[PDB]
Design a protein around this nucleic acid. Structure first.
Lengths: 352, 256, 254, 254
DNA sequence: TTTATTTATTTTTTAAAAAT
DNA sequence: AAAAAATTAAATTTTTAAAAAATAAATAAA
DNA sequence: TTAATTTTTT
């Protein structure tokens, strides 16, 4: 939720980004922000405008997509923890009001495009319309409960609890292309984790330790940098983008010096809103306790999974049976550890 | 400007036939002290530490410690152009962009120049300490190749039990059970077909079989396999080639 | 308890290489007089009578007349583990439901113990007695193997005929037709390569060459094969092994 | 009326394994002066000219000119029935469409009669001006098999260049550049392993390597390959069949 | 036996269709 | 020129099969 | 959630 952070780390700190392979993370416990993945499947997997839906009336495109993505997530050996969002905070209410206003404008343009008759405009304006309800996340948590793959309900935000599970070492990394995990404090962030045979995108792995080594900052100055160049929690100062926020952080550290020394006659602080509440909410959120979780990848239920997905979602039998067989093969293969648990990485050889 | 005329090109052809199935994309750490390759598996659970020292090559010459990354499938397909006795001559030019491979047959004069395109890699090299292993097992290499090749039909994992009597390879699967148990050769007629055990303490570890098959793809390099292992420490499958270097092989155990 | 040492373990290895392609699962009958297998094909057209008697076994011990169910592909893979010079010790512990296979190397270094997971399978044995067969031929098995590999390209049908002169391997199909004439010879100096033919009636019988190719896959067992046949009785492809036993291959004509 | 006793029976096996994958159907134009086969490719790029004179056959009885169409996959799987030492007799008749092949063996008493049905096809006949080519080499056939088999892994194009030092093969592709230089032989006096170059001017042409992989299936026919080419004519790959015939392969430049 | 050579099930490969 | 903000602008993955590449499983004279 | 690109601006 940081406007222009991945391009910034691609610009000024190239040593953080290691675009690795999806095969590379064998046996890595991984926390995953799941709600954006649910919108990725409910936006992407459509049969020509219509979402992939069944006889009873509900949609099952997210169930389809994350069953298939999680089976080839274990087929590369990545062990996921799909972390689900909870109650959003009162500081996120302005951005959620902006999202609701953009959804209302998309609804008005969809009502224009339905009378217009262009099919691509209707499918794009319903591709910017997707919003879940707790019934959708309950169906997904029923899938992950029958998966034998652990779900965790975050209290406030899923990426904050993902960053806490990386910080306690309960998982190796947080997997989302949302960039808030480096703000909330995660050392390793896994962008673009797509478990596909069409391996069009490498796994963009973001290291916070190389960011803090390269930029020479602690956690607090990086949180102030992300607040200055734009977050989904509080408004940024108008006129300061990525590079001048990097220079303003690097010339004096805290945001209090930034708001107390910079003149309002050129770059004014908008609305005189206090950024310190967003700072303390990035550092200390209502976060999940990482020592009280049960990160156990058990044996999957097969017959109850078939009964669920073909008694109230009416899927096809042989693809789920091949998926559960690949899941059983991966559960037999998942006891193999890495060499990184025994031999430490002492650099990376780069060719010319 | 790198140049290394290797008079026994079957050794380097067997190195790339070994490394082709295990690593798809690898980076060669070529220095003045010798030729090194340290790259893991794509699943990052099986490391190869190739060493080809400068004394094994005839005319070794390297100015700067140039690191380059090749496609091992493409380099294996280009080293299959050389014969069994073809003298493989390495050449990398100063400010390297391609690798030239010259294959000279000894009897028939034939210069098989093979220029090969280089490519860019980011390969994590790892600091392996010089530790001493408890279970160190010397085997004939075809015997260990046979053991991995026929226990791969049984299951997905071999429990390598190490005793003072001999090393025991146990694999269990849905087809059945298997227990290949060896003995230390008290009566030794030949060195290359003898099993020596160098115990400090008995260990019992489980290793996967796909990477073990990729290790036993290095069988025609040397006739000896130095199976070095300890408790919850990765297994060393050392293929010490004749006075030119040593091809290590690392594998993380299936921990329980 | 069943225990059966077997020094020439290559013989049992090519028995399982012979029965890998035909039979997936059969009941390996164990008797005091040897191991028997009166199996029957998965395509249900041909009968297999494997008999390895107990005098050619080096150390044979059998208490109960048990018939365990053996997956032949699994025992073919486990005997593909076994080397060509390995002393094979078959074992079967009572109340275990496991056929244990122990391979001993010629040197006293490598011991290869394997086991199986059997199944509760039973078969209805038919039983064909050995009556006075009219037409018996005995050619070398590599030559008959070459004959079936010759005629399998032309079509999936062989017309094996006999006369006073010699055996005729007629075949026909979409590629043309091919007649292979193999005559008898009066050569008693060589036995594993010369052919003797005893004939009573001039008979023409039509078979299928897919199952005859599967019987052709048994020829490394011996250099002596036997095609005994008559007018209406289905033929055998008898594989004359030495003192351990034999291997019969019954096949109904088309 | 046609009979052709070929006594060294590996020759026709090597011809049919040479021309099996390249030509699917052609016309064996058989005359009284010897068996000829002049045919274009099935993909219609490469010309194949096969000519065996009558002095190599032991009993070549040809009454008149026979121009009949023979399926090369059919005749290649018929010659796969033959052994590597037998005697191949091509009995034929123009009344029926039967090309009978009889395989008398010296080692055995095998008579393998093989009558083949023949299809009616339009007999292609394209002449070649028998010119003195520019670069005519005489280089080993296993070396050409090795060179085409290894340069085909780089790309589908070889730049065959002749010079005073010798022939140069150069293939470029996705894996890189591969240059193979074959020099002379000074004082070995071997003249089968030896490479001799007969050149008036140096040339440089680009040839496809898939068709050269098809052309190197004739490498057990001879130990020498006579590549003769000029700047505009196709490359002529000639295999000297046992000093009793020749197989010429033509390939247009790329 | 040992070393390579074909056949041919086995796999990826892009690029197509539907996936419910 | 360098750098921000307005305004869109994109979120997936089976199976199927056309086309091409690799092995071990036979296949077997050399 | 993140980009891509024209427009606008220090």
């Amino acid at each position: 939720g940081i406007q222009g952070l991945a391009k910034l780390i691609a610009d000024v700190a190239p040593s953080a980004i290691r675009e690795n392979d999806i095969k590379s993370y064998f046996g890595r416990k991984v926390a995953i922000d799941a709600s954006m993945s649910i919108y990725q499947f409910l936006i992407a997997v459509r049969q020509g405008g219509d979402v992939l839906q069944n006889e009873e009336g509900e949609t099952t495109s997210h169930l389809m997509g994350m069953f298939y993505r999680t089976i080839r997530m274990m087929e590369n050996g990545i062990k996921p923890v799909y972390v689900f969002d909870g109650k959003p905070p009162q500081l996120k209410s302005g951005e959620l009001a902006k999202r609701s206003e953009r959804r209302a404008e998309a609804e008005k343009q969809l009502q224009q495009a339905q009378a217009a008759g262009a099919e691509q405009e209707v499918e794009k304006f319903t591709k910017r319309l997707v919003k879940v309800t707790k019934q959708h996340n309950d169906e997904c948590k029923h899938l992950l409960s029958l998966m034998g793959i652990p779900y965790l309900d975050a209290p406030s935000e899923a990426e904050a609890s993902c960053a806490a599970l990386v910080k306690a070492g309960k998982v190796y990394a947080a997997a989302t292309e949302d960039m808030d995990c480096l703000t909330f404090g995660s050392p390793v962030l896994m962008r673009h984790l797509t478990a596909s045979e069409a391996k069009k995108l490498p796994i963009q792995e973001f290291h916070l330790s190389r960011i803090l080594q390269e930029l020479g900052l602690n956690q607090e100055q990086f949180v102030d940098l992300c607040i200055l160049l734009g977050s989904d929690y509080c408004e940024s100062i108008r006129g300061i983008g990525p590079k001048r926020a990097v220079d303003l952080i690097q010339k004096h550290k805290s945001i209090e010096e930034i708001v107390r020394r910079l003149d309002p006659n050129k770059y004014p602080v908008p609305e005189n809103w206090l950024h310190k509440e967003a700072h303390q909410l990035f550092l200390e959120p209502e976060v999940l306790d990482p020592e009280s979780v049960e990160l156990k990848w058990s044996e999957p239920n097969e017959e109850e999974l078939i009964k669920f997905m073909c008694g109230e979602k009416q899927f096809s039998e042989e693809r789920i049976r091949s998926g559960v067989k690949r899941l059983s093969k991966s559960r037999q293969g998942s006891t193999q550890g890495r060499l990184d648990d025994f031999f430490k990485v002492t650099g990376s050889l780069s060719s010319a | 400007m790198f140049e290394a005329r290797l008079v026994q090109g079957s050794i380097l052809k067997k190195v790339l036939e070994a490394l082709k199935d295990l690593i798809n994309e690898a980076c060669w750490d070529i220095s003045s002290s010798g030729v090194n390759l340290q790259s893991m598996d794509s699943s990052h659970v099986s490391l190869v530490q190739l060493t080809l020292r400068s004394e094994g090559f005839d005319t070794y010459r390297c100015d700067r410690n140039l690191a380059m990354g090749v496609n091992l499938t493409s380099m294996s397909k280009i080293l299959k152009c050389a014969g069994n006795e073809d003298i493989i001559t390495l050449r990398a030019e100063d400010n390297a962009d391609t690798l030239a491979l010259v294959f000279e047959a000894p009897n028939q004069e034939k210069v098989s120049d093979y220029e090969m395109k280089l490519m860019d890699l980011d390969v994590e090299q790892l600091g392996i300490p010089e530790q001493e292993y408890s279970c160190v097992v010397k085997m004939p290499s075809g015997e260990f190749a046979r053991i991995c090749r026929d226990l791969s039909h049984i299951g997905d994992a071999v429990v390598i039990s190490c005793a003072k009597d001999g090393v025991k390879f146990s694999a269990s699967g849905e087809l059945g059970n298997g227990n290949i148990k060896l003995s230390q050769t008290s009566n030794v007629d030949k060195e290359e077909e003898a099993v020596t055990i160098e115990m400090n303490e008995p260990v019992q570890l489980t290793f996967a079989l796909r990477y073990l098959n990729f290790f036993t793809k290095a069988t025609p390099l040397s006739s000896t396999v130095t199976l070095s292992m300890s408790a919850d420490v990765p297994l060393v499958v050392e293929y010490k080639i004749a006075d030119m270097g040593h091809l290590k092989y690392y594998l993380a155990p299936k921990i329980e």
